[PDB]
A paper describes a structure:
AAA+ ATPases of the MoxR family are ubiquitous and found in all major phyla of bacteria and archaea. They are proposed to fulfil chaperone-like functions assisting the maturation or assembly of metabolic protein complexes, and are often found in an operon upstream of a gene encoding a von Willebrand factor A (VWA) domain-containing protein. The most well-characterised representative of the MoxR family is the E. coli ATPase RavA, encoded by the ravAviaA operon, together with the VWA domain-containing protein ViaA. Remarkably, RavA and LdcI together form a 3.3 megadalton cage-like complex, consisting of two D5-symmetric decameric LdcI rings located at the top and bottom of the cage, surrounded by five RavA hexamers.
In addition, cryo-EM analysis of free RavA in the presence of ADP reveals the presence of two distinct conformational states: a RavA spiral containing a single seam, equivalent to the one inside the LdcI–RavA cage, and a planar C2-symmetric ring with two nucleotide-free seams at opposite positions in the RavA hexamer. This second conformation may represent an intermediate state between the “seam up” and “seam down”-oriented RavA spirals inside the LdcI–RavA complex. 3D classification and refinement (see “Methods”) resulted in two maps (at overall resolution of 7 and 6 Å, respectively), corresponding to an open spiral with a single nucleotide-free seam and a planar C2-symmetric closed ring characterised by two nucleotide-free seams at opposite positions. These medium resolution maps are sufficient to enable the high-confidence flexible fitting of a RavA hexamer (for the spiral) or a trimer (for the C2-symmetric ring) extracted from the RavA helix generated from the crystal structure. In contrast, the C2-symmetric conformation contains only four ADP molecules bound in the active sites between subunits 1–2, 2–3, 4–5 and 5–6. The 27 Å gap between subunits 1 and 6 in the spiral conformation is much wider than the seams in the closed-ring conformation, meaning that rearrangements between subunits 1–6 and 3–4 that destroy the nucleotide-binding site are more subtle. Loss of nucleotide binding mainly results from a rigid-body rotation of RavA monomers 1 and 4, accounted by shifts of helix α3 and its preceding loop, which contains the Walker-A residues A51, K52 and S53, and helix α7, which contains residue M189. All of these residues directly interact with ADP in the intact active site interface. A comparison of the C2-symmetric closed ring conformation of RavA with the 4L-2U ClpX crystal structure reveals highly similar assemblies. Importantly, our structural comparison shows that similar rigid-body like movements between the large and small AAA+ subdomains in a single ClpX subunit, or between the large or small subdomains of adjacent RavA monomers, lie at the basis of L to U subunit conversion, resulting in an impaired nucleotide-binding site.
Author numbering:
A (entry chain D): 3 to 87, 98 to 437, 442 to 497
B (entry chain E): 126 to 312
The structure:
């Protein structure tokens, strides 16, 4: 039964996209809010199919009435909800399933005082008594942004979904859109895919009963702290976080799941932002958490470094078995030219360990990675050489010199000798920790391959999650070589 | 209520709704609305935008100043008047006009050219889709079955919206009409 619900939802949005190109993220987003009692905000230039999406969602229900209205500066409440005689509200807003309000950032003070009461309570003042409003989806489109200190900020804080629609960009999707013969005022949804009034009231009870796992809540536990230390982060109150749970629970209910999935957090990129400055910060902070702390991407990166540091510690401890012999060469030269090993070493940025550690540049080091392009010039011509410490930082100058037994001696500030050595051609302790970390990467990758088929997930976001998981698996495979 | 009569072609007649057989909608005024006013919704939906003015030719002013033709009569013969059946049949054949690949290269080039200039007027997706309905009918009533590149001249009275966009739309289209329309600049 729960698995068959994802098929009907995926087939319902397929018929709604007929005639609307590059609008898949806008149709699937309005469908989730229509079946959960939420709202959706659209931002963009006038003329990007912002009014057809409001008239297309009414076909998914058996009894749904549309309402199109443009809020003006001189508009009166007697024209939106209906004039009074006791109020002739036949076919307006109190008795409409889907309402459309174009340009909401320019209405009068009387309309703003009435729109904030039909969302939290869904009631209307019919003269004396009050009556409920069966509003299933509230969409609002405009073009500009409201002021930072005005009366229009109260309606923006209550709108959960805030989408930023724009014109088409693909050339192949523009030819079929410019020559579309599908009627926009027709009914392209079959009767078998249309939901009834009984299914809408039953789904509202099953949304709040979705189990909340403790591992999925850890993502919002850390994402909330990152959006508070930065001064450029948008202010997200507790009312916005409470309404985001209903949208996340309903996203997994219509996808054939009983619990909240960590992949449902991508929908938060169109709910926390509020202007053009917060768009580049919300989409960047979520992308880091979705490719870091989501599927244990960053959690396994910091754990892999401990295995590499432990492997380098065991290599520098047993460096007394393999030394470093430098062969000599003949020829006619004024200086003693030295040659490196032939086929024994071929890497350019090879690493060379050392026995007794020293204090270089007021810090400790365990391995010095040299360059093959600069080692040949120092062993023949001479002069000074450079080299970074611990494989990081800039190439600092060291006190490298030759020894009597054809070895490399590195001195510091106290004239302390240290013979260098190269790592030989995997211990049991390193292979044990590497096998346990590799098993966690396969278990985390299996969870992503079982929940990425959600309908409320964009297509361009799947390319970044797969690329981030493959980077962690490629780094752990190089250490076991 | 005027916006619903164009998209939905209906009217809220109390309870039930009824269709409106509006075949032509003409709106005239004198001035232009504000840039941040609510009147821009009806302006963005109007396809053809003509800027009429007074006469300038001296020969055409003498015959116009002394005209004996009645403006409230019927100077159209009965043989040239279309019927209700021909109007409903032509609406189906307009959308069936093929779109050649050579015409698509000119529409995408003119659209991307206006998005780079800051002083160029913005053209929405509704303006591009509705302009094809007038361009496909221009070749259907002229004896053609496909969209001709010569039909791009009609865009000079649709893309503009004020006095600042009039000198830029008529100049950008004239370059494409005398450059990439007949492979003038391509050669
Ligand atoms: N990006 C788009 N893709 C497909 N069709 C579109 C797009 N933008 C507009 N249209 C078409 O243009 C028609 C009119 O749209 P309109 O209501 O003017 O958009 P808006 O409400 O943004 O002004 C619609 O029937 C729609 O099919």
């Amino acid at each position: 039964h729960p698995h068959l619900l994802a098929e009907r939802i995926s087939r319902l949005s397929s018929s709604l996209e007929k005639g609307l190109y590059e609008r898949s993220h806008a149709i699937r987003l309005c469908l989730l809010a229509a079946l959960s009692g939420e709202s959706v905000f659209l931002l963009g230039p006038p003329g990007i199919a912002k009014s057809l999406i409001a008239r297309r969602l009414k076909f998914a229900f058996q009894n749904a009435r549309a309402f199109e209205y443009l809020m003006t500066r001189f508009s009166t409440p007697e024209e939106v909800f209906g004039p009074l005689s006791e109020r002739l509200t036949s076919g307006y807003l109190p008795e409409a399933e889907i309402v459309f309000l174009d340009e909401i950032w320019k209405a009068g003070p009387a309309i703003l005082n009435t729109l904030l009461t039909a969302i939290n309570e869904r009631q209307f003042r019919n003269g004396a008594h009050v009556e409920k409003i069966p509003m299933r989806l509230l969409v609002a489109a405009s073009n500009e942004l409201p002021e930072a200190d005005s009366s229009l900020e109260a309606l923006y804080d209550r709108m959960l979904i805030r989408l930023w629609l724009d014109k088409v960009q693909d050339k192949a999707n523009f030819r079929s859109m410019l020559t579309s013969q599908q009627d926009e005022n027709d009914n392209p949804v079959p009767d078998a895919l249309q939901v009834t009034d009984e299914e809408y009231e039953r789904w509202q009870k099953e949304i709040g009963e979705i189990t909340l796992p403790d591992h999925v809540f850890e993502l919002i536990f850390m994402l909330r702290q990152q959006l508070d230390k930065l001064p450029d982060a948008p202010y997200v109150s507790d009312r916005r976080w409470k309404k985001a749970i209903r949208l996340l629970q309903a996203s997994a209910f219509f996808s054939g799941r009983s619990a909240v999935a960590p992949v449902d957090l991508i929908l938060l990129k169109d709910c926390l932002w509020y202007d053009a400055q917060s768009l580049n910060l919300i989409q960047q902070q979520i992308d880091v958490l979705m490719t870091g702390h989501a599927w244990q991407q960053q959690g396994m990166l910091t754990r892999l470094g401990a295995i590499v540091q432990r492997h380098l510690q065991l290599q520098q401890q047993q460096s007394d078995k393999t030394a470093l012999t430098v062969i000599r060469l003949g020829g006619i030269f004024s200086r003693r030219q030295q040659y490196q090993l032939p086929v024994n070493v071929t890497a350019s940025t090879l690493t060379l360990l050392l026995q007794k550690p020293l204090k270089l540049h007021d810090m400790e080091v365990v391995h010095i990675s040299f360059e093959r392009s600069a080692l040949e010039q120092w062993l023949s011509k001479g002069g000074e050489i450079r080299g970074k410490l611990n494989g990081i930082g800039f190439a600092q100058k060291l006190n490298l010199e030759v020894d009597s037994a054809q070895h490399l001696v590195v001195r510091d500030v106290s004239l302390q000798g240290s013979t260098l050595a190269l790592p030989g051609s995997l211990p049991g302790e390193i292979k044990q920790q590497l096998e346990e970390l590799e098993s966690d990467w396969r278990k985390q990758h299996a969870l992503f391959s079982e929940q990425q088929k959600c309908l409320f997930i964009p297509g361009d976001w799947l390319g970044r999650i797969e690329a981030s998981l493959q980077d962690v698996g490629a780094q752990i495979r190089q250490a076991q070589q």
